[PDB]
Design a protein around this nucleic acid. Sequence first.
RNA 1: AACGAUAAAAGAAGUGAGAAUCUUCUUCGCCGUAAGGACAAGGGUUCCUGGGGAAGGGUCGUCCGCCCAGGGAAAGUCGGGACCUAAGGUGAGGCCGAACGGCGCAGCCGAUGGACAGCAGGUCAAGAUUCCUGCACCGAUCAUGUGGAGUGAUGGAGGGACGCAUUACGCUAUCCAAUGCCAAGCUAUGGCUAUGCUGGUUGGUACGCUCAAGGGCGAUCGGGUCAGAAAAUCUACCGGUCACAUGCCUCAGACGUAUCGGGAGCUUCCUCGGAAGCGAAGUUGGAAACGCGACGGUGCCAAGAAAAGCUUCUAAACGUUGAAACAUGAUUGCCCGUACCGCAAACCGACACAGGUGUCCGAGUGUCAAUGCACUAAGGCGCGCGAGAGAACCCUCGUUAAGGAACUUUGCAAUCUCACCCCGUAACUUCGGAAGAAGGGGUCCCCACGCUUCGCGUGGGGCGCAGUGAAUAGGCCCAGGCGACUGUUUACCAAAAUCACAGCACUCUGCCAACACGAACAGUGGACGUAUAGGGUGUGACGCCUGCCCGGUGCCGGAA
RNA 2: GAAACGAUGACUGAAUCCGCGCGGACCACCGCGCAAGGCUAAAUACUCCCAGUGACCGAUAGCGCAUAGUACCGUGAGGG
Lengths: 93, 274, 47
Amino acid sequence: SHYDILQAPVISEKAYSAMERGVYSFWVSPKATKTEIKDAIQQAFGVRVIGISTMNVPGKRKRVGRFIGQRNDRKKAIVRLAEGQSIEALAGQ
Amino acid sequence: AVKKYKPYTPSRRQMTTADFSGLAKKRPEKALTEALPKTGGRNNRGRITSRFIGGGHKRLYRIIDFKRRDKSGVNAKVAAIEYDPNRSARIALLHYADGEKRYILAPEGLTVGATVNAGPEAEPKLGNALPLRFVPVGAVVHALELVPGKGAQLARSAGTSVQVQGKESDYVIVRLPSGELRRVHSECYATIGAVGNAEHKNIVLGKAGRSRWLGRKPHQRGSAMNPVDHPHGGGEGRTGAGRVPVTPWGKPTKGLKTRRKRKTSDRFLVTRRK
Amino acid sequence: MKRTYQPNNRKRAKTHGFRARMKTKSGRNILARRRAKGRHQLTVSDE
RNA sequence: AACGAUAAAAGAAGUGAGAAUCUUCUUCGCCGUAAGGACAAGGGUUCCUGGGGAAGGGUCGUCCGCCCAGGGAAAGUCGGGACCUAAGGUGAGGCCGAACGGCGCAGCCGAUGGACAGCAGGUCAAGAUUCCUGCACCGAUCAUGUGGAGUGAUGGAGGGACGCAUUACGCUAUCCAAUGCCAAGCUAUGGCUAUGCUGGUUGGUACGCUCAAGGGCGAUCGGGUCAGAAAAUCUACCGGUCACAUGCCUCAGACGUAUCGGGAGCUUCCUCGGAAGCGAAGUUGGAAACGCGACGGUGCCAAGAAAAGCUUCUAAACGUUGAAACAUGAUUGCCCGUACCGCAAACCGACACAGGUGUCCGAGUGUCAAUGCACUAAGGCGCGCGAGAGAACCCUCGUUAAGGAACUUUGCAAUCUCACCCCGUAACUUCGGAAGAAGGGGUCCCCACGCUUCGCGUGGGGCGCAGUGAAUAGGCCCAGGCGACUGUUUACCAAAAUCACAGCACUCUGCCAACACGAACAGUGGACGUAUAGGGUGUGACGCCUGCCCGGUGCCGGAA
RNA sequence: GAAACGAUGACUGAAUCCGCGCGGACCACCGCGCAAGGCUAAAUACUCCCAGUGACCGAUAGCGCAUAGUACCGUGAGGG
Ligand SMILES: [Mg+2]
Ligand SMILES: [Mg+2]
Ligand SMILES: [Mg+2]
Ligand SMILES: [Mg+2]
Ligand SMILES: [Mg+2]
Ligand SMILES: [Mg+2]
Ligand SMILES: [Mg+2]
Ligand SMILES: [Mg+2]
Ligand SMILES: [Mg+2]
Ligand SMILES: [Mg+2]
Ligand SMILES: [Mg+2]
Ligand SMILES: [Mg+2]
Ligand SMILES: [Mg+2]
Ligand SMILES: [Mg+2]
Ligand SMILES: [Mg+2]
Ligand SMILES: [Mg+2]
Ligand SMILES: [Mg+2]
Ligand SMILES: [Mg+2]
Ligand SMILES: [Mg+2]
Ligand SMILES: [Mg+2]
Ligand SMILES: [Mg+2]
Ligand SMILES: [Mg+2]
Ligand SMILES: [Mg+2]
Ligand SMILES: [Mg+2]
Ligand SMILES: [Mg+2]
Ligand SMILES: [Mg+2]
Ligand SMILES: [Mg+2]
Ligand SMILES: [Mg+2]
Ligand SMILES: [Mg+2]
Ligand SMILES: [Mg+2]
Ligand SMILES: [Mg+2]
Ligand SMILES: [Mg+2]
Ligand SMILES: [Mg+2]
Ligand SMILES: [Mg+2]
Ligand SMILES: [Mg+2]
Ligand SMILES: [Mg+2]
Ligand SMILES: [Mg+2]
Ligand SMILES: [Mg+2]
Ligand SMILES: [Mg+2]
Ligand SMILES: [Mg+2]
Ligand SMILES: [Mg+2]
Ligand SMILES: [Mg+2]
Ligand SMILES: [Mg+2]
Ligand SMILES: [Mg+2]
Ligand SMILES: [Mg+2]
Ligand SMILES: [Mg+2]
Ligand SMILES: [Mg+2]
Ligand SMILES: [Mg+2]
Ligand SMILES: [Mg+2]
Ligand SMILES: [Mg+2]
Ligand SMILES: [Mg+2]
């Protein structure tokens, strides 16, 4: 359902700085429509979104011993809200 | 009659070009230009069939009607005489009081601004479209069809004439540009006059190029080829056949008749072409 | 000098592709024959 | 043997277990229509950060395009799709065929093309017409008002809609000049003490009676059924009518004003050197596009896509107290593509390979011009062995007494010639040419004078061996053979006298044409062509011409 | 072949009970047979898979693999 769509938050110098300007960044399910993501974030956080952007991200191909393989392809979503609305569980961070 | 050229490049002496000064400078009708792609002489299985075709200027088709029975009775006027690339003949535009615009082959002499009338009741003057029987004997005519309403299949290239030898059964005895005598149903339409351009036979190509501009790839002498390639191939020099002159496929050329021996049309040919 | 193999994604897919191979009995016959050999690479679209 | 182009290196300093190879500094050298910059195709994390050093690197590595980890890629407006059609591929029905199958109208797929709303800036260690700032735009849905009767399709018409060469007028990008403007500081080594030197010198938006070349232009009435299946204020005919010079319309760009940026640098703090803050000027003169005004002008023959969106008209329809249309406001904004290499060490070449790879951009000085040549800016690089030696011999070059083809199969090779201006120029000819034939002169600096300027002419003067002072840069002729000519060919030993060629001839072919590909009474090429056309064969510009033999053979014709 | 018999592509085409078809040209006789209408398990074949066995192999042998149709080569089929 809703909660299924949001795999994880993005953790990195970039993303923190973004939330410090009130802009948050989530690892999403690769098939997700932007509207689906928008709605999902709203329900999960009771926050009105004014802007989204997304990006499909090919997973790094790495090797373990003789075994060459690919990590899961992902999708990154960046959202910016109105009203300087924040999200607590990820703001203190 | 023809344009000539001073010899300022070697292949510019012999060269000549047609006289266009009598062609009303017009783009063809938007409602009458069709798209004509080329073919290498390749057919829907992709193989060369017609041999030595390719290149040449891009061409649009200009729809013509030959069977004028659509507009029989009513008459039009000559709007212009334009250039058509895919025909030896110049063509001309028709404006009917009816309101429709049409394209018909443009006969020798027929000037812009003239009016012309199709349908059984029409004078023996240049351009009218008459059934054959209504045509006075010995007349000079072209655009003859072989079946009433099927459309003009005879006398179409520049400067060609059909001269009605005269009536007979249901049919009319007809003289073909080849010198052949044929029987044609008198119900078949026709259009009064010689075909036009006519000086077309005299133009000189001049430079290899010209062939290419007319989409004609160079034509290969068998004698140059190899045994593997063609009957006349091989030998240790310039060689003279070494057998009867023969096509790529082996059937004799030079003299061998080819028209199918048993055929329906035969009892409509009164004299062989000669 | 210019060499034989000159990469083209659309070429390769349209030529050695799965849809391509399935479009004909002989290509179907490749597919089956390959499956049988236990190839990881059934077909070019597997790359 | 070799360490993969002879573009080149030197010192200091740092680091480190270890340094000719890594980092920094100072120089030196090499590319600069490129060896710089930006796309596409392809590749696939190679990008950034931090670490590593077995192997990969033709040495060495502390380094790397290698190994490990973590980060990094953001779109209503760019490209693709939710739009369009081309070749082509498909294709219910339908046409053929032992089978699998081959065709095939409409429809459909199909970009390399049509269509289509966003610009200026800023900044991560790594993204940017995507994010942030600043101000626009587009469709869609709704609300409030202007509503106050039409809306107009799956069919019609208009339109989209197209070539090559050349060229007039105006402008921009952009580059040059200067005792224009602005900012900084200095006096070198004999002089300069600024009139020297260095650097910078306007991008978007809005408005404006300012300027403005160029470019686009019929209106309406009526008639004709028969044309557009039908309809029809639409279209096409026919007829009538409307003050030719033009005005009607547009405004590339310019100027102005305002405003948003940017801007040489200045400052401050500081952590193998970055962070923020601040901000001057905006001139005059000149050059100038393949870009824009533009769907311009002229000339030519080989005669130069389609469909949708768009505009217009009815059919049907539901309406006609809510029909289009407008204005403001709100709302909304899908999918995939964006990192990096991308003339190359990241693509194709088994390699970090002297090869190959499509498009755009591609500054200055000098030079008749230039994308040529030399040097150079920005930018990029010194090509991942090094050091000494200074023999034979080998390669690539410089010069060479006297002679000058005596060499040799052959002047093979190498030299001579070399640009621009003026003078001058043969046989021969198809009167175009041969022709840059041949040959001779000139070329630099100063000064005055004249003229149409960047310049040139004239005169006089000056210096050297020499003045296209270096680089780019024809040796010529006489006479044959072959082919007329431009062209074409054996990827990787032959470029020619081969092929093709315009011209010529023979012949076949009357159109379901001959001819050709075919499982085939399918379909297709020929050709949406029609004997001034089409196939096949030979000859090969042009000129003068093209003889004798029909027994054999082959073709056409004959018939007891 | 003296070529019966079945089998169809083309043309043509009879009797139904004293009738019809065969018996290796063809005739008589003597024998065997009821075409042109349909289904039918069982014994037989094979071995991807499963189990047992072996004067079969034990790491160049045995399957190509002590596992992999992988690495690698090729545009591809395919090889490996
Ligand atoms: Mg995206
Ligand atoms: Mg890795
Ligand atoms: Mg010929
Ligand atoms: Mg030969
Ligand atoms: Mg033969
Ligand atoms: Mg021969
Ligand atoms: Mg050595
Ligand atoms: Mg090297
Ligand atoms: Mg060296
Ligand atoms: Mg130390
Ligand atoms: Mg080095
Ligand atoms: Mg230092
Ligand atoms: Mg480059
Ligand atoms: Mg990618
Ligand atoms: Mg090493
Ligand atoms: Mg260390
Ligand atoms: Mg790196
Ligand atoms: Mg935006
Ligand atoms: Mg098909
Ligand atoms: Mg495209
Ligand atoms: Mg656009
Ligand atoms: Mg688009
Ligand atoms: Mg101009
Ligand atoms: Mg300018
Ligand atoms: Mg000065
Ligand atoms: Mg001094
Ligand atoms: Mg369509
Ligand atoms: Mg990029
Ligand atoms: Mg190689
Ligand atoms: Mg190297
Ligand atoms: Mg290379
Ligand atoms: Mg330039
Ligand atoms: Mg230059
Ligand atoms: Mg150069
Ligand atoms: Mg530099
Ligand atoms: Mg580089
Ligand atoms: Mg000498
Ligand atoms: Mg000498
Ligand atoms: Mg001699
Ligand atoms: Mg030589
Ligand atoms: Mg002369
Ligand atoms: Mg000379
Ligand atoms: Mg002297
Ligand atoms: Mg001199
Ligand atoms: Mg030279
Ligand atoms: Mg030649
Ligand atoms: Mg040549
Ligand atoms: Mg060769
Ligand atoms: Mg050669
Ligand atoms: Mg029988
Ligand atoms: Mg062992």
